[PDB]
Symmetry: C5
Subunit: 46 residues, 5 copies
């Protein structure tokens, strides 16, 4: 059929996409962390 | 058939690239935080 | 309209790719401030 | 053969994933280096 | 240009394989600019 190779690749791009997805969750976590670090430098003026 | 399959590809190419606009948004959030932290460093 | 459906793919592989550029364009800004942030090693 | 070029696409695609994997591995290392640093400043 | 639109496509997969590859060399600069900050405690 050659849709034989079309189906393997779909599946692929959705993997690529779900990794990106999860990678994004690691980008946002880094914010909650950068924010809690930009704030600790404020309370502790030293 | 083959044509039908290529669209899924197109939608997956848009739902992917779509995902990246979103990610580049976080990247910009971090950079502003970084700068906010650096200025709060010049002082102490 | 199949060879033509690819003409959109090429349009978008190039669109996406031009967006993965900005994400990279930004990655460097972060890596820059971190350099300035580093320096106040003794201050 | 055109069916054959496709194997170049699937391959090059797995060359993407095999990497987007390496990259996400780059990203977590940052989260752990930040969760740890925070906890450093947390004790002053 | 089916078979010819084939390579133009495979091409962008190698040039896009470069963007991610580099975008990665930068991500590594961040992490060692961060460990070069964590241990700094």
């Amino acid at each position: 059929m050659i849709e034989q190779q079309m189906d393997r690749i779909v599946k692929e791009m959705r993997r690529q996409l779900e990794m990106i997805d999860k990678l994004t969750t690691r980008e946002i976590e880094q914010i909650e962390l950068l924010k809690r670090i930009h704030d600790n430098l404020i309370t502790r003026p030293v």
